[PDB]
């Protein structure tokens, strides 16, 4: 846990952020998959222009 973002005993809304669990080992493979998408997206758009 890095912080909590609610006053205790408050009416919380469905979808409101409660905690902040450490995004240290998930931002890594998020940007890994983001880099793989940034490769394959401008592979597929190039092939879509060439098949035309």
């Amino acid at each position: 846990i890095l912080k909590r973002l609610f006053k205790e005993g408050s009416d919380v809304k469905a979808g409101q952020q409660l905690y902040q669990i450490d995004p240290a080992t998930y931002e890594a493979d998020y940007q890994s998959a983001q880099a793989n998408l940034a490769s394959t997206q401008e592979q597929a758009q190039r092939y879509k222009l060439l098949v035309a």
């Binding site: 401008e42 190039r46 092939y47 222009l49 060439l50």
Partner: protein
């Protein structure tokens, strides 16, 4: 005999020119496709030069 074989050589070379024009058309359309593949980003300039030569 000489005028017969001269007309036969001319008759063969008409078809030789007719085939060479079609080879030029096939090479030119291959260069057009490699120029389109270079203009977008798939092929490098090395394949573009090798298609131009």
């Amino acid at each position: 005999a000489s005028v017969a074989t001269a007309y036969l050589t001319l008759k063969a070379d008409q078809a030789q020119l007719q085939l060479t024009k079609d080879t030029l058309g096939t090479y030119q359309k291959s260069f057009d496709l490699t120029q389109r593949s270079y203009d977008v980003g798939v092929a490098s300039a090395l394949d573009l030069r090798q298609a131009q030569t």
